[PDB]
Design a protein around this ligand. Structure first.
Ligand SMILES: Nc1nc2c(ncn2[C@@H]2O[C@H](COP(=O)(O)OP(=O)(O)O[C@H]3O[C@H](CO)[C@@H](O)[C@H](O)[C@@H]3O)[C@@H](O)[C@H]2O)c(=O)[nH]1
Ligand SMILES: Nc1nc2c(ncn2[C@@H]2O[C@H](COP(=O)(O)OP(=O)(O)O[C@H]3O[C@H](CO)[C@@H](O)[C@H](O)[C@@H]3O)[C@@H](O)[C@H]2O)c(=O)[nH]1
Ligand SMILES: OC[C@H]1O[C@@H](O)[C@@H](O)[C@@H](O)[C@@H]1O
Ligand SMILES: [Mg+2]
Ligand SMILES: [Mg+2]
Lengths: 160, 160
C-alpha cells in the first residue's frame, strides 16, 4: 500500500486518474447515506461515501478498509452489489485551483443498519439520510451522487 | 489527452494504480489476439492488447484512441462487451526493477475480421491468433491474459 506525501500526491492528481470506490448505502427505511465535503475538490456539496484505492492494494482489501473508514463498519466486497464503472471530473483539487481531479469509480450498493455505523461522535452531523426522491430534489447533492439515482445516467455505464 | 514525461510517469507508476482497457479480440475462426511484450514489465510474455487511460480522458475517448493504437481499427466503446474489472500486478516497471506496476483493468470482449487489423508479417512473430484451449496450455501466455478464459478466475470479478 502507499499513502503519499502532499508533494507526491499533488503530482499524481495532476498527472493521472485516481481510482475510487463509492458506496450507495441504504438503511432499513429506504434512505440513502450522504456526507458533506467541506474541503476541495468541490467543497460545499453532499456526496455518497467513498474513497481512493492505493498503490498495490487489491479492490477486495480496499473495500474492507474503505467501508470501515467511511461508515465505521468493516464489510467484505461480497456484501456489495457492483454498480458500474463511473467517472468523476472536478475543476479543482485537494490543494487548490491549479489543476483538475479525475476519478475512475467503482460503485457498490448495499444495505446497513444505522445502529451498526460506529463513527466518532463529533462527526455525526456530517451525515444525513435521504430517500431517493428527496436527494434528487436537494440543491445540495452533487451531480456525481445524483447520477446513481437517475435512469438516464445509468445509460452506457460499463457494468450496468 | 495527457502523455507524461519519463520522470512524471515514473512517479505515477511508483505511487498509484494505473487504469487500463484490455481487448479480448476474437476472429472468425474463434482464435484470440495476443501480442508479444517487448519491454518491461513482464518482458517476453504474451498478452491480449490494451493500454492505459490518461488524465482527464473519458473511457469513451480512451477506447477509440486505444483500439486504433493497438489494433489499427477505430472502434467506439459500444462495440465492446464489458467483461469485468480486473487487477494486474507486476514485480517490475517500464524503467527497471526499482518499483512495482499496478493496473485496475476494464476488460472488453469483441469480434473482428483478422483482415482489417494493422498487423505485421507473421514471420516476425510479434502477434499470434490462438484458440482459448491453446493459450490456456501455454505458460508463455501471461496469467493475467489466461485469466480471461478461466471460469475459476471469473468468480469475484466486479461486472462478471
Ligand atoms: N496526502 C495524501 N492525501 C490523500 C491520499 N489519498 C487520499 N488523500 C486525501 O485524503 C482525503 C480522504 O480521501 P479518500 O476518502 O481516500 O478519497 P476522496 O477524495 O474522499 O474520494 C471520494 O470522494 C470524491 C468526491 O469528493 C469522489 O469523487 C470519489 O469517488 C470518492 O468517493 C481526501 O481529501 C484526499 O484528497 C494520499 O495518498 N496522500
Ligand atoms: N513516458 C510515458 N510512457 C507511457 C505513458 N503511458 C503509457 N506509457 C508507456 O507506453 C507503452 C504503451 O502503454 P499503453 O499501451 O498505454 O499501456 P500498456 O503498458 O501497453 O498496458 C497494457 O499491457 C499490460 C501488460 O504489459 C496490461 O496489464 C495492461 O492492462 C494493458 O493491456 C508502455 O511501455 C507504457 O509504459 C505515459 O503517459 N508516459
Ligand atoms: O510497458 C508495456 C508495453 O511495453 C512495450 C510493448 O511490449 C507493449 O506491448 C507493452 O504494452
Ligand atoms: Mg472519502
Ligand atoms: Mg499497449
Amino acid at each position: 500500500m502507499m499513502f503519499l506525501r502532499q508533494e507526491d500526491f499533488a503530482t499524481v492528481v495532476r498527472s493521472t486518474p485516481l481510482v475510487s470506490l463509492d458506496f450507495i448505502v441504504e438503511n432499513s427505511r429506504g434512505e440513502f447515506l450522504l456526507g458533506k465535503r467541506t474541503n476541495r475538490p468541490a467543497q460545499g456539496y453532499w456526496f455518497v461515501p467513498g474513497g481512493r484505492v492505493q498503490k498495490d492494494e487489491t479492490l477486495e482489501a480496499a473495500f474492507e478498509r474503505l467501508t470501515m473508514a467511511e461508515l465505521g463498519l468493516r464489510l467484505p466486497i461480497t456484501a456489495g452489489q457492483f454498480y458500474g464503472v463511473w467517472q468523476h471530473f472536478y475543476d479543482d483539487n485537494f490543494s487548490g485551483t491549479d489543476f483538475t481531479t479525475h476519478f475512475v469509480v467503482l460503485g457498490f450498493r448495499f444495505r446497513v443498519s444505522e445502529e451498526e455505523l460506529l463513527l466518532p461522535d463529533e462527526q455525526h452531523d456530517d451525515y444525513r439520510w435521504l430517500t431517493s426522491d428527496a436527494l434528487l430534489a436537494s440543491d445540495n447533492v452533487h451531480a456525481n451522487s445524483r447520477a446513481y439515482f437517475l435512469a438516464e445516467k445509468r445509460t452506457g455505464v460499463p457494468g450496468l
